[model samples]
Target: KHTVRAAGAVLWRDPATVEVAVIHRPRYDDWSLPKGKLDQGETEPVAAAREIHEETGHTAVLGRRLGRVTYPIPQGTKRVWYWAAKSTGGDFSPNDEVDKLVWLPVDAAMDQLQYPDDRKVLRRFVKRPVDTKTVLVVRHGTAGRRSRYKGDDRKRPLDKRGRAQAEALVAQLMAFGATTLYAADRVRCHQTIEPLAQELDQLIHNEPLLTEEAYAADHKAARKRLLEIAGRPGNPVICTQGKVIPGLIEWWCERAKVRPETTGNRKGSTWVLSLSDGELVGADYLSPPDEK
Candidate 1:
């Protein structure tokens, strides 16, 4: 069945006390989480960010994938994707879509929401810490097959399309307020995040421990180093290779007793891993932007 796709978030803030955003829609005469149907060809994350901002008048840094909900709408069946998004900054005022916005504690928000599934999304939101650290783990952009390159595999660089892919990913990473950049020893890995480095005027730290060769020889070190990165002060954007991503992500999920969510290890794909005190709490997958 063709389903109408929509996206939103459990938009939250906790400067003083943890609170979630709920909006009052004059059209529906109901209070609900901020959300709307996807814009043409928009990725779910982008749609979620846009809709939340549109309805609440708040910018948000997206975190983990909360879950999805399906329900009947007047047109047909509707599927909504939800995420754990932290409010960055913005003030609410009467808008065409939303006339009222309230930032309330979860208990109160649940009482105020009109949909049961919205509360279920909130239930999943509270399953993990609202303040969980975000780490963006990217598979280096599409490098040509290793067999096609005569040079050392480590020196192979991102082709033109891969370079474009890398550039396109910068916005998605920055949406989470990427603070630092890191990549495996390969030039392909480094190039994958070069655009991001340029965006922030920050240096890309090369970590040998993240390289496939290094990870294959000593997987534990890679895992330990990633956890160390997660424990630091700001959100990090990491670029590594396909060979190491699935295993490393699966290993981390195993440690946290969480199942992996992924679409094969495609070049240019990314994982949004959420951690609470260095333990994995949420994992969401994002396929790279379309090649141009």
Candidate 2:
């Protein structure tokens, strides 16, 4: 049996004072963090943003994962994934799901929260600095079998499973507030992030330098461009091939001086790169959605 899944974030602001968002759910008649059930075929991260906007009227740039709460509900085992997200911009008005929104210091929010699980999520949020930034390094989903493709290898497209993975990726990448999308020249790489680009209503910026051949020719330059994009204002997401992803991650980890216990380069996997002041600070590898 499939468990009912919901997702949301502990929306916070580090204005001179650390403030957290708590919402009043008219139906539940209780104050809790903004969250909602996952829509059909929707990934948790995407649903998290959509629910926050629907309930609290705020768009958030998600930070580190704060873990999840799983409990028994009538629907089944209800699992809610939580993250530490900073409210970027959005306006909240009284709505059917949420009637009121309050911003309080973490201590105050913890005291006001109606659920112990929400309090636990808030505690995780306060453990990290609020200004952390994210950059997503995604492996292009599985493409048509190379042996069967007669045309140029770079022109190969995604298979059915790969297409599903791409759709799921839209939410996972969006969870980190991916605003700018970049992809290799390969068709599969472009296709992998196409849904996310459409969701963000932004055009994908093609980077020939990110292609496997190009990276092999000049990895230093390729790595330079990757960092340059990461340095941009908006959180960026890049979809590249298996050949380039592992090496690129190795380069970044060495430069950042962080040793990852293990790194996976499977198709459809993602590396959530945490940056602060334009320098790489941490990296967390996420398996493909189906595997997760």
Q: Provide the clashing-pair count of each candidate structure.
A: 0, 0
Tell me the TM-score of model 2.
Answer: 0.78
> lDDT by residue for model 2 over 95-140, one digit each (tens)?
7868899989888888999899888888766655557888899998
Off by over 4 Å in 1: 72-77, 148-152, 261-263
lDDT of 1 by residue, 230-259 (tens): 788899988998778888888888878876
lDDT of each: 0.84, 0.83
Q: State residue 49's C-alpha deviation in candidate 1, in Å.
A: 1.9
Predicted model with the maximum TM-score: 1
In Å, residue 220's CA in model 1 sits off its true spot by 2.6
Compute the lDDT of residue 255 as modeled in candidate 1: 78
Tell me the TM-score of model 1. Answer: 0.89
